Structures are given as structure tokens and as C-alpha cells.
């Protein structure tokens, strides 16, 4: 029934997603704007949105208990082959079954399926990235239920280049322990039916997304007038 | 592979 060191975990990642997770999206103006006028036409935006949201994500995992013990070489697997996959969970609160798209506190900042393909993305990317919003909504986790299955994540012990799994594994231990107590005690019924297994799954659905939407990056920045705008950090993590 | 953009947002 929840031990004081599982309620110590669930405030240091509701804080440290507050932290990184601002629901006004000020900093959305300093991007490069976004245009709909024109092939590749939002890649500018959202490139600079991704970007933005990588730097996020680190700071979120930084706060991670445990994740600091790890070595920093284990560190840069571990954010480096996630990120798209958070970014993807995260932006689930922007998410909106209305008209299916990320609203962002307006129109400008709204961003739906054709906003999408102008970043360089078909259907094949798409459709599949927005089945995954949809499930995920449905599911209408807990804040805490967020946070968590962001921060589980982000320590997954089977990604490849992993050199401490073992180490790795043992927070992520910690961390299921305290979601799998947590649905138990604070997630009540039919909220909680194999919420757990819902939520595992859509870590593998994430893996298939990530596999497909990276083969896209690289045809995408595979040609250097593409390439050429983006930001640094994307090219850096994402590879280059 | 050296990553001193993500290692200076780690540290
Ligand atoms: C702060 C927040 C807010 O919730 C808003 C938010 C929205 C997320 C969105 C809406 C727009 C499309 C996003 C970026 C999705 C991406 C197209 C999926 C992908 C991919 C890869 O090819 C990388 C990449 C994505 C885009 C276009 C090009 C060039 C770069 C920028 C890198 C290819 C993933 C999450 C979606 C992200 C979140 O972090």
C-alpha cells in the first residue's frame, strides 16, 4: 500500500514533470514560426519544437531517482534512443480526440495531420502515431500514471548499447513497483483493469514507432537542404 | 560517439 519511499518517487516526477512541462507553452513563440502557405513547409517549426522537447526530456530524466548513479556513457543510450518515445507520451497532454491534433494554446500552435506531412511525413508514419494518442487517451491515466510510464521509459534496460542493464534494470524495477502499487491503491475500478498491461503494451507500441518514424529521419536528413534546417541538438542525439 | 550538447544538458 504504498511505502513512504513510492510516495517520495511519485512527487519528485509530478515535480520534475512540472518543471520540464509547461501546459502555456509560452516558449512556443521563440521558435522559428510555423507556416501552412510548400513542401516541408512546417519542418522549420517543428523541428525547433522537437528540439525544444529533447532538452525537456533530458531535464525530466535528470530527476529520475536513481538516474543520476548511472554512468554517463549509459546516460546518452538511454536519452538517445527514448526521446522520440517521450516526446511522443509527453505530447499525449496536448493531445485532443476533438479534432484529432496538438493544441497548444492556439491556433498557430495547433497542430493536426496535414501540419504533420509538412514536415516531411506520410501516412504510414502518421496514421500509426495517432492510433497510439488515441489508446493512450483513452486510458486517462493519473498524472502520476504519466509521469511514471514517461520515467519507465526512459530506463529501459534492453536498449541497445547498454552497458550496465543490470544497474539500469534495478531502477526501472523501483519505478514499475511504484506504478503497479500506485494503480492498485489510488487508481480505482474499471480505472485500474490491466491498466498496467495496457500501459506495457503501449511501451512496445512506442518501440514501433520509434523504429519506423527513425528510418524516416534518415531519409529525411540523408539530404543536406534538409538536414540544413534543423537545429543542432536534433542532429547531435537523433545521430549525424 | 561524443554527444556534448546532451552531455552539457546532462551534467
Ligand atoms: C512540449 C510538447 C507539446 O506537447 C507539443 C508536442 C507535440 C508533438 C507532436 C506534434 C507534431 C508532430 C510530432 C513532433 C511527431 C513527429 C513528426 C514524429 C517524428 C519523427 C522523426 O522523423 C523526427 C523529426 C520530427 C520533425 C520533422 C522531421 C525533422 C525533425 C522535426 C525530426 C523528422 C512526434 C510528436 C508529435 C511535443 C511535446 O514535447
Redesign the interface.
Known sequence: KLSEEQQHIIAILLDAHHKTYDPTYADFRDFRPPVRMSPLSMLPHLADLVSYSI?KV??F??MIPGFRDLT?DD??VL??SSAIEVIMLRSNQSFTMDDMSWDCGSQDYKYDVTDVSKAGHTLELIEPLIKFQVGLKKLNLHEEEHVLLMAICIVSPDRPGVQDAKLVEAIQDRLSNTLQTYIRCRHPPPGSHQLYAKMIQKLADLRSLNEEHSKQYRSLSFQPENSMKLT??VL??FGN | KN?????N??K
Do not use: D, F, R, T
Open positions: 532538452q533530458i531535464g530524466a535528470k554517463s546516460q546518452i536519452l538517445k543542432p541538438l547531435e542525439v | 554527444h556534448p550538447m546532451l552531455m544538458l546532462l
